Amino acid sequence: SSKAQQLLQGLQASDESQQLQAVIEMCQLLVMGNEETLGGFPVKSVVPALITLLQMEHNFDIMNHACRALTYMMEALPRSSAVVVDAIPVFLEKLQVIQCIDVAEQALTALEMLSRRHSKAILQAGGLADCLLYLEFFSINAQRNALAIAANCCQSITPDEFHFVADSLPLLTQRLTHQDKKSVESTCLCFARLVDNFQHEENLLQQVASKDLLTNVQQLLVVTPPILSSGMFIMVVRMFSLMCSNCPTLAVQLMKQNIAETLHFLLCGLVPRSPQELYELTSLICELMPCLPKEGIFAVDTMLKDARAQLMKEDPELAKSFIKTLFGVLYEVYSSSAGPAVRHKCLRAILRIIYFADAELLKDVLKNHAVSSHIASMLSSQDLKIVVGALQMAEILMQKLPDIFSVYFRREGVMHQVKHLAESNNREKIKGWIKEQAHKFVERYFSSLNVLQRLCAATEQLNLQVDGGAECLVEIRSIVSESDVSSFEIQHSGFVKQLLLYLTSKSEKDAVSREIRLKRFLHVFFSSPLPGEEPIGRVEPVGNAPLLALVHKMNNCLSQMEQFPVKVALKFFNTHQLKCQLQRHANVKQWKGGPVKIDPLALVQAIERYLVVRGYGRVEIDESLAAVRHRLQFYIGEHLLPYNMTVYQAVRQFSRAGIWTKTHTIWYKPVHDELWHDGVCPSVSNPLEVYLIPTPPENITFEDPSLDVILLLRVLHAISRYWYYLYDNAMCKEIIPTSEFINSKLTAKANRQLQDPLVIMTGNIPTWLTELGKTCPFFFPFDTRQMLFYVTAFDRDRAMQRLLDTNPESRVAPRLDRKKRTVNREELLKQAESVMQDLGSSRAMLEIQYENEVGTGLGPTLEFYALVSQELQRADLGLWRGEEVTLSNPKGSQEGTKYIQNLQGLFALPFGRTAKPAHIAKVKMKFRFLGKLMAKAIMDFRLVDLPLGLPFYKWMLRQETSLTSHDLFDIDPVVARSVYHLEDIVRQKKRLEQDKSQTKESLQYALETLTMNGCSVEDLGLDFTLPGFPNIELKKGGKDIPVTIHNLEEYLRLVIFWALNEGVSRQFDSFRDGFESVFPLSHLQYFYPEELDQLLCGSKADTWDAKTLMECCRPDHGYTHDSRAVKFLFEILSSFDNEQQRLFLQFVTGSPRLPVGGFRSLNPPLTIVRKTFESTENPDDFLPSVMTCVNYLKLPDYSSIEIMREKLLIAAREGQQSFHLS
Amino acid sequence: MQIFVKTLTGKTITLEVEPSDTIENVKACIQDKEGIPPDQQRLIFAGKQLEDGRTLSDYNIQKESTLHLVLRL
Amino acid sequence: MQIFVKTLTGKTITLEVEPSDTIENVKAKIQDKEGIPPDQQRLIFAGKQLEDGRTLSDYNIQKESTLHLVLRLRG
Amino acid sequence: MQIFVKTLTGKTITLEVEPSDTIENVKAKIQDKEGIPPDQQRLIFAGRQLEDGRTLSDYNIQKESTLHLVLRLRGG
């Protein structure tokens, strides 16, 4: 302030140089300061002096500095803009006539800054035309400021004043077609605000609309790629909705301009869109159509809560064209959504279209569509608006066309539903109206067939007490394949329950055993051999169509009857906080403070820490106790409170408006080896018998009218996956690929439920979704299951981070910790082990720095994960099978180091009973480290590069007891042939022994005569050592016991058991112990053995091409589209064999993997820019630059593709494993 | 090239950038290295309040240059 | 006197060097060998990065030695 | 041929030039008529700034052309 006063006296001077120095020092002091430092500055006296100094035009260099000083005064502290904002007339007058461009630009910037909080003053000053008097021949950076101030002035405009914007309306209307983005957005926002504010005056809307604005907005919307953002897209569509609704003549004019084609192009061109966009588009479509009469059967609308008609009464060609154009698209949108509001809007639009159309048009349009099924399905719904809509639609449609809709309703199950319906005040009134209307309908119209009876006769023969042979099954197959049975007759005639009890029943009272029934089903559907006539060869049928047809019919039926509820505020949650009362349940101090601050997202650990610090934990603020062991515990009722649980969830569950209002109380209180001797092994488990049960599993608790179909589909999926366990010989192959079981509506409902921020804030995913995901995972694709796993498996911060990284959307801001460790590139194993042991279980993200590097961020961590993953495969440790290879392009010291590589996969080596304990201890420690590393990598959304095999994942998912001989092909190929041939021989042995028409000597001679490729078992001379590892005994004494025909099945079983389960048991037990120290294995039950690879490592490798590259790549900063270097690089990228692809990925992103989805899934798109060089050095001998933190590529301009190729390879190869620039 | 940034409290943080970089990238690096969110950060230089979305080549910043960082409340 | 310069992966280049000289001359020779600009190349010797503007005499660099090459590209 | 020049305050100036005359010659004629220093003008025609090294035929400037005169100042 001491210098401020002197600057004031300098400002109040006369010498021009003195004034220039004063203003320069003023701006210098203003820019550097802030609110804290510049406190006490006098503004009420300095500001008028600055205004007076600016009110003079005898010099051109001090005006710029005066405007700059005022602008920086505004920017320094946002408190002076009540007295500083007084020279608005001076600014406007300086804008009227221009002498210098810079002063006008600075005045525009200052005015734009001022307009944020004070727009009424500038509106009264009449600056709407003053700005944009000379809008052209300005700089690019001032046009956006001028348009922003125009929009802010138009934000709050009174109906009384219109002459202030009437002059400039055509200018903005023409400007609405500029090639830039922000200018177009600002002009669109201005027009939207004008239309919204002038909604109750039809004349003003007519004046604003004109005839060029509509067509310009039309071309702006149609032209792609989208130059307009999603929010302003919604705003523009809402402007259309308001103009159409509030002015019928504008709606007619808009219809005359073939808006149907524009809407068709927008909706399909269906392009995936946010629910808000679809809601706005459906509202527009509904508003284009004439209003519904309020008299007649539509009187229920009064309690549930013109010019278009003239145009329809005129030449109806336009209306017919519109209806025929958009009815199909509207129905398609309706049949592919799940949301309370979109469905209602679509229903209203469809009802209006049906009502206002004539007979011929309705007959033509309702040909390739299904309406009766939807009406029947939507009659029975708890939401009591859809029932009324369905009833009205049925009444109107059947009153217009009686003949055609007399058999469809009867077959599809509408008449029965209306009959069932016919057989604190608004609810009663609407119920009474529904009852009366249903009674009138039934009494008036529906008062007084070889498929339903055929199905009933077929399902009568499926009863268990009566034998049926196989004619019933072939009749059912014929009906399912070649007929037109609806989804109502299948329910009406008991078929799903009869089939379920046919397949999954086991009792003495059954006429036919379960095995014969299963064989009969597998013969009628799918071409498996008939029981009792199994061929001596190998089973491999071709036909599988009937099972697919039955599965599709069941899926459609389930989709018809499904009734699961979807449930889709922020300021309330972010602002209001919780207050609770603590009461003793008595060695600790008694609580008397009263209310306790409880954040809605807070955990009980914070409460425990606060209690400990406060001194209530004893048996002054102390930090030693805060700086593991548990001393205090919080209880609510008889249920313990987990540490990883939020107080809001605890109140909701153990203890709505009451959650946030009523006080809650939490109590506190201080805290003979048979295998080695005899040679017997456990039997092979058959997974099918676990699934074959009529009763629902214990995990299922929800009640829905569509549960029997779910159970039948579960049984069918189990049969399809596991069908070769019911035959002595078969090949492993699914009858139906699991991708064909996906339900198109359950997936949509799950995806919609997984997009609400609030249900992830509170973690209130409904029971049905979790239970279905954990019990029947085939109903959803991989992405939905991954999303659900990430949301429900961990804390809320990680879930919201995942949501932000996969769906850009009272603003949410995830909060997380960040702890950094430094390592060295010489002892990576030991340092990684120490880091994992110290910080493995910590709930904070792990970032790793390097000793001689400055770079920090995600790139170093990804590089560390890749290095550790590569290091875990060295041939010195000796943990997996495979061959020894030399890595391509190694480091300085990594050259010559053997690495274990296998073409099929990796499996752990076995040890028997003669292994040194130190070796086993080393193997167990390494396995624990690997398990902990994988568990930590899964949490932090990181990617590894460890090519594991299928049996590894089966072991991980607790499936070690169902490993048959077909699982040796994925481990060791050479021994699989021997095992298969020996099984073929033992089958022949059994077949020979199953004949009683021989003698003992003849039987012995026949057994001995059997040969394998011209050689006998005696000639082979094998033993009880596992092949390939001549140091492991299958059983004690396995050195002097040769293999013979009499002991061959035991030998094969011992080999399989030792090679798959026995010798690799302790290792995987150690792996499970290491993995479960982070998060339990029970959270991986969603996935499948063939799908964990995508979750752990990256996506499958594929060739890159420019067509998919023109979807995420966004070049700028000297590399506009249709340039030379960009196309050269784009062409040279797609010339790799995935090796240079991995090199480029590690060069730019830092990891040799990509997220699921390709180049689009990467949150920071690959942004390519130019690099600045000097005018002397040629722009040819330079290397490209990369910033891995945000994926910022800086690519030098060149002239030859060959030079690009020859320098990119050197850049990738000679610049790895270092961060010397940051 | 190397740049130095200093605050009102008094501390010299050294960064290494390139002329083709972006001011937003520099602010993100400062946020990562210090924890200050890139919303209250104000970068002033030679009297200007430098804006975002531009490059250091525009502001003729050369080797061994000093920048000023002032927060806001 | 044929001092060797070894890159990261596998390449090695001979270089006849004067006893006393600046780093810029050796950099020019390395550029003639490969073509690395004077903006991304860093030299590491023993356990220290060779600072520019000095001579090999003060770095205790004698005849028939090996200098490892590192490119300052990533971020 | 004669062309018209419009500045930031109007003042339509009719200047006689030749198709072979460069933009530098037009600037010299404008300076002779008025006196604006060469380092302050930012002559822009049809929304595009006119390079001094080009000629009228390069910018397709014809008879009765309505040029726009724009001033400029140092940055910082």
PDB file of C-alpha atoms in Angstrom, chain A residues 28 31-37 68 72 75-76 79 141 818 820 847 854 856-857 1117 1169-1172 1185 1187 1189-1190 1192 1194 1220-1222, chain B residues 6 8 14-22 24-26 28-29 32-33 42 44 46-49 51 53-55 57 68 70-73:
ATOM      1  CA  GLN A  28       3.168  -4.401 -13.024  1.00  0.00           C
ATOM      2  CA  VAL A  31      -0.523  -8.490 -12.260  1.00  0.00           C
ATOM      3  CA  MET A  32       1.944 -10.008  -9.780  1.00  0.00           C
ATOM      4  CA  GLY A  33      -0.258  -9.575  -6.708  1.00  0.00           C
ATOM      5  CA  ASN A  34      -3.167 -11.630  -5.431  1.00  0.00           C
ATOM      6  CA  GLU A  35      -6.013 -11.295  -2.939  1.00  0.00           C
ATOM      7  CA  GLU A  36      -3.804 -11.872   0.108  1.00  0.00           C
ATOM      8  CA  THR A  37      -0.897  -9.616  -0.865  1.00  0.00           C
ATOM      9  CA  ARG A  68      -4.784  -3.318 -19.518  1.00  0.00           C
ATOM     10  CA  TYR A  72      -5.853  -6.659 -14.541  1.00  0.00           C
ATOM     11  CA  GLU A  75      -8.751 -10.082 -12.792  1.00  0.00           C
ATOM     12  CA  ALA A  76      -6.643  -9.639  -9.642  1.00  0.00           C
ATOM     13  CA  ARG A  79     -14.523  -7.883  -5.510  1.00  0.00           C
ATOM     14  CA  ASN A 141      -9.295 -14.203 -30.702  1.00  0.00           C
ATOM     15  CA  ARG A 818      -0.683 -41.042  -4.204  1.00  0.00           C
ATOM     16  CA  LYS A 820       5.676 -42.722  -4.723  1.00  0.00           C
ATOM     17  CA  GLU A 847       3.396 -44.589  -8.700  1.00  0.00           C
ATOM     18  CA  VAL A 854      13.214 -36.706 -13.625  1.00  0.00           C
ATOM     19  CA  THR A 856       7.139 -38.901 -13.232  1.00  0.00           C
ATOM     20  CA  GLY A 857       3.587 -40.074 -13.844  1.00  0.00           C
ATOM     21  CA  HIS A1117      -0.784 -27.338 -34.284  1.00  0.00           C
ATOM     22  CA  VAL A1169       1.652 -31.633 -33.718  1.00  0.00           C
ATOM     23  CA  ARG A1170       4.581 -30.010 -35.487  1.00  0.00           C
ATOM     24  CA  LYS A1171       8.010 -29.409 -33.961  1.00  0.00           C
ATOM     25  CA  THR A1172       9.675 -25.999 -34.097  1.00  0.00           C
ATOM     26  CA  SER A1185       9.302 -36.461 -29.807  1.00  0.00           C
ATOM     27  CA  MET A1187       5.136 -36.917 -24.207  1.00  0.00           C
ATOM     28  CA  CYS A1189       1.784 -38.504 -19.916  1.00  0.00           C
ATOM     29  CA  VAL A1190      -0.933 -37.108 -22.217  1.00  0.00           C
ATOM     30  CA  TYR A1192       1.386 -35.716 -27.147  1.00  0.00           C
ATOM     31  CA  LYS A1194       5.526 -34.013 -31.962  1.00  0.00           C
ATOM     32  CA  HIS A1220      15.412 -37.826 -19.257  1.00  0.00           C
ATOM     33  CA  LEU A1221      12.932 -35.082 -20.209  1.00  0.00           C
ATOM     34  CA  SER A1222       9.938 -33.832 -18.223  1.00  0.00           C
TER      35      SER A1222
ATOM     36  CA  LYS B   6       8.975 -19.563  -8.363  1.00  0.00           C
ATOM     37  CA  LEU B   8       5.359 -15.903  -3.597  1.00  0.00           C
ATOM     38  CA  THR B  14      12.973 -26.692 -12.213  1.00  0.00           C
ATOM     39  CA  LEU B  15      11.270 -28.136 -15.289  1.00  0.00           C
ATOM     40  CA  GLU B  16      12.511 -29.250 -18.700  1.00  0.00           C
ATOM     41  CA  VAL B  17      10.236 -28.476 -21.647  1.00  0.00           C
ATOM     42  CA  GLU B  18      10.349 -28.028 -25.421  1.00  0.00           C
ATOM     43  CA  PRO B  19       9.251 -25.134 -27.668  1.00  0.00           C
ATOM     44  CA  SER B  20       6.485 -27.269 -29.224  1.00  0.00           C
ATOM     45  CA  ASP B  21       4.872 -28.074 -25.860  1.00  0.00           C
ATOM     46  CA  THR B  22       1.549 -26.746 -24.573  1.00  0.00           C
ATOM     47  CA  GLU B  24      -1.681 -26.883 -20.317  1.00  0.00           C
ATOM     48  CA  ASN B  25       0.928 -29.659 -20.344  1.00  0.00           C
ATOM     49  CA  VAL B  26       3.285 -27.496 -18.270  1.00  0.00           C
ATOM     50  CA  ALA B  28      -0.308 -30.496 -15.592  1.00  0.00           C
ATOM     51  CA  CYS B  29       3.352 -31.274 -14.879  1.00  0.00           C
ATOM     52  CA  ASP B  32       1.789 -33.618 -10.703  1.00  0.00           C
ATOM     53  CA  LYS B  33       5.035 -32.390  -9.132  1.00  0.00           C
ATOM     54  CA  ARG B  42      -2.116 -18.380 -12.903  1.00  0.00           C
ATOM     55  CA  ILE B  44       2.205 -14.516 -15.731  1.00  0.00           C
ATOM     56  CA  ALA B  46       6.627 -10.198 -19.091  1.00  0.00           C
ATOM     57  CA  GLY B  47       3.428  -8.492 -17.931  1.00  0.00           C
ATOM     58  CA  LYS B  48       0.959 -10.814 -19.679  1.00  0.00           C
ATOM     59  CA  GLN B  49      -1.382 -13.243 -17.958  1.00  0.00           C
ATOM     60  CA  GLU B  51      -3.672 -18.076 -21.478  1.00  0.00           C
ATOM     61  CA  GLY B  53      -4.326 -23.683 -25.413  1.00  0.00           C
ATOM     62  CA  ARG B  54      -1.212 -21.981 -26.820  1.00  0.00           C
ATOM     63  CA  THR B  55       2.432 -22.988 -27.204  1.00  0.00           C
ATOM     64  CA  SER B  57       6.870 -20.812 -29.218  1.00  0.00           C
ATOM     65  CA  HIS B  68       5.970 -16.627 -12.283  1.00  0.00           C
ATOM     66  CA  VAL B  70       0.536 -17.058  -8.540  1.00  0.00           C
ATOM     67  CA  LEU B  71      -2.380 -19.014  -7.098  1.00  0.00           C
ATOM     68  CA  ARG B  72      -5.909 -17.754  -6.454  1.00  0.00           C
ATOM     69  CA  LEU B  73      -8.597 -18.190  -3.816  1.00  0.00           C
TER      70      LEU B  73
END
